[PDB]
Amino acid sequence: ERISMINPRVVLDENGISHRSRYFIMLCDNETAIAHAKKTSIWAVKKDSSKRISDAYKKASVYFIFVAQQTYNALGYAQVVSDLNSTELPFWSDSSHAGGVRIKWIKTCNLFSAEISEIVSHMDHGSEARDGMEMMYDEGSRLCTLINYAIMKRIGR
RNA sequence: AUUAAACA
């Protein structure tokens, strides 16, 4: 079996994934989409990653972590709070999208962290993250913590 | 406070 190095109580599968809590990266190259998602709390899910995301959502809490494609700036993270909906597409989607999901924003931001950029840079077996991919429990945990730290360091609070 | 959740 396999052990979280962040919280060893968390049971992981052989891919480093927790079946209780699962994390996907959304690499953002479209300012209209992320701003609309920040306003409305709806995200359009790509066909290429929809089945894995809906499979995850059967039993786990599912989170999307938003990163800017060109800079690897963190843009925030959100919990998925509905099933995928073929008839809830936001205006900005296209036929590359499967449907919309409601999200609950946890954090929103636009900032650079060297550690976040490193994690994203190596997320795919040592190579750059792919949009929509599922990351390991420890990657998702550490990214949430790093986003929370950067925003706390702002407020500061 | 824009205080991750889960696990306990």
- Domain-wise residue ranges, chain A: 1-157
Q: Rounded to whole angstroms, how far apart are CA atoms A70 and A64?
A: 18
Q: For strand A97-111 and strand A2-3, is the pairing parallel, antiparallel, or unpaired?
A: unpaired
Helices A137-155 and A114-121: crossing angle, nearest 10°? 160
Protein residue closest to B3, using CA and C1': A157
Class of residue A85 by CB neighbours under 10 A (exposed 0-12, middle 13-18, buried 19+): middle
Nucleotides of B under 7 A from a protein CB: 1-8
**Taking the CA of residue A104 as centre, how many other CA atoms within 13 Å lie in the half-sphere pointing to its CB?**
7
Q: Which long-range contacts (CB under 8 A, 24 or more apart) does A49-57 make?
A: A49/A24, A49/A131, A49/A132, A49/A133, A50/A84, A50/A98, A50/A99, A52/A24, A52/A132, A52/A134, A53/A24, A53/A80, A53/A84, A53/A101, A53/A132, A54/A83, A54/A84, A56/A22, A56/A24, A56/A134, A57/A83, A57/A84
Q: Is A15 helix (H, G, I), strand (E, B) or coil?
A: coil
Neighbour tally for A94: CB within 10 Å: 8
Q: Rounded to whole angstroms, how far apart are CA atoms A150 and A145?
A: 9
Technique used to solve these coordinates: X-ray
Q: Is A62 helix (H, G, I), strand (E, B) or coil?
A: strand
Please give the radius of gyration of chain A, using alpha carbons only, rounded to the nearest integer.
Answer: 15
Q: Rounded to whole angstroms, how far apart are CA atoms A25 and A129?
A: 8
Q: From the alpha carbon of A147, which nucleotide's C1' atom is closest?
A: B4
Q: What is the CA A137 to C1' B7 distance in angstroms?
A: 13
**Residue A87 CA to chain centroid, in angstroms?**
22
DSSP letter, residue A39: H
Look-up of token digits 């990351």: A135
Q: At what resolution in Å was this solved?
A: 1.5
Q: Rounded to whole angstroms, how far apart are CA atoms A36 and A43?
A: 9
Q: Rounded to whole angstroms, how far apart are CA atoms A45 and A53?
A: 9
Q: Which residues does nucleic strand B approach, with CB less than 7 A?
A: A 7, 9-10, 20-21, 61, 63, 76, 106-109, 140-141, 144-145, 148, 151-152, 154-155, 157
